[PDB]
Amino acid sequence: GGQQMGRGSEFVKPNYALKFTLAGHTKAVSSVKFSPNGEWLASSSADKLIKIWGAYDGKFEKTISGHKLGISDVAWSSDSNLLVSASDDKTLKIWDVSSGKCLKTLKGHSNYVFCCNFNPQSNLIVSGSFDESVRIWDVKTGKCLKTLPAHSDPVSAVHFNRDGSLIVSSSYDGLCRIWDTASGQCLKTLIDDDNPPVSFVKFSPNGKYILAATLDNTLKLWDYSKGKCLKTYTGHKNEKYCIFANFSVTGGKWIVSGSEDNLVYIWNLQTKEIVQKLQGHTDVVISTACHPTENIIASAALENDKTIKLFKSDC
């Protein structure tokens, strides 16, 4: 399963190993994200809370509370100063991480908010809801700028591209769609062979590819421009949950994903071979994230487990 890097690194394989277990959520963990400055990890959970943890030492930092119901997702602003969280209470909240205070409550979704992201500039927030819409929000004012009639089933993920000009969304309706941020126009619908639920979607770091999870135990890498599936990653278990997937780019080039058999799966991006399965969790691994500058994976698991874990690799 080795990958070619430079001279003397012809067969690179990651060696992720567990360094810290982060306990404190009292229900299912739903989402973990590293802040872009690499200092912190935020976690959101069904217990209504967000927790901030040190990214390198896993030291508990603070609890941020105020949502009336479970939280499905959380995301950092580009300057690591703010958080947005998506909740079952039908709102998003924008948070000052330093103070722990709720800056804004974004109201307009008429059903659970399931997924969120800031644009790279961080003047906008994108959200996906059980209400089947994608909304675009002004961070400074709290206004809903746009409501996109995006899908015909709950919206599972939303993500901006590298320059903020495009939004990708995914849904149980079997579609992955790409929206023009400025116009709200649907630019592309990507769908393959079959029509399995699309459980996760995100742009690659350069914004030229889209990684999509489908609930038939498959991850795919798509060329966005050409509308074509380029790689298929299989082996893991994913038939039920909206699991987060990642591009790992700090060392070797990997795809990293949680999985319903309690493992983190890591694949060689080029050859599609499985290169690592990470043990330690005792329930579905619902979330994974990849540190922005170090080879660090954060994982998180569902209600039977309740833990976040940090693993580190030499590549």
Q: What distance in Å separates the CA atoms of residue 116 and residue 252, rounded to the nearest whole number? A: 28
Coil, helix or strand at residue 163: coil
205 sits in the region (left: phi over 0; alpha: psi -120 to 50; else beta) called alpha
Strands 198-203 and 186-190: unpaired
Q: What distance in Å separates the CA atoms of residue 250 and residue 290, rounded to the nearest whole number? A: 9
Cβ-based neighbour number of residue 51 at 10 Å: 23
Cβ-based neighbour number of residue 76 at 10 Å: 22
Residues 6+ apart with CB under 8 A from 101: 95
Q: What residues form DSSP beta bridges with 286?
A: none
Strands 124-129 and 113-118: antiparallel
Cβ-based neighbour number of residue 232 at 10 Å: 12
Distance of CA 73 to the CA centre of its chain: 8
Q: What distance in Å separates the CA atoms of residue 18 and residue 311, rounded to the nearest whole number? A: 4
Distance of CA 258 to the CA centre of its chain: 11
Q: What residues form DSSP beta bridges with 315?
A: none
Token pair, residue 25, equals: 């959520």
Cβ-based burial of 136 (10 A; exposed 0-12, middle 13-18, buried ≥19): buried
Q: Decide if 214 contacts 157 (C-beta within 8 A).
A: no
Give the Å distances, CA to CA, from 103 to 62, 66, 81, 93, 99: 17, 11, 12, 7, 10
Please write down the HEC assignment for all residues of the chain.
CCECCCCCCCCECCCCEEEEEECCCCCCEEEEEECCCCCEEEEEECCCCEEEEECCCCCEEEEECCCCCCEEEEEECCCCCEEEEEECCCCEEEEECCCCCEEEEECCCCCCEEEEEECCCCCEEEEEECCCCEEEEECCCCCEEEEECCCCCCEEEEEECCCCCEEEEEECCCCEEEEECCCCCEEEEECCCCCCCEEEEEECCCCCEEEEEECCCEEEEEECCCCEEEEEECCCCCCCCCCCEEEECCCCCEEEECCCCCCEEEEECCCCCEEEEECCCCCCEEEEEECCCCCEEEEEECCCCCCEEEEECCC
Residues 6+ apart with CB under 8 A from 193: none
Which residue in this structure is represented by tokens 């495009």?
A: 166
Measuring CA to CA, which residue among 220, 213, 209, 281 is closest to residue 243? 213
Q: What residues form DSSP beta bridges with 136?
A: 126, 146
Coil, helix or strand at residue 225: coil
259-281 in b/e form (b: 16+ CB < 10 A) is bbebbbbbbbbeebebbbebebb
Measuring CA to CA, which residue among 111, 114, 116 is closest to residue 136? 116
Q: What residues form DSSP beta bridges with 3?
A: 12
Token pair, residue 53, equals: 């943890």
Q: What residues form DSSP beta bridges with 93?
A: 85, 105
Q: What distance in Å separates the CA atoms of residue 153 and residue 169, rounded to the nearest whole number? A: 12
Q: Which CATH topology does 1-315 take? A: Methylamine Dehydrogenase; Chain H (2.130.10)
Q: What is the DSSP letter of 240?
A: S
Q: What distance in Å separates the CA atoms of residue 211 and residue 116, rounded to the nearest whole number? A: 17
Q: What is the DSSP letter of 261?
A: T
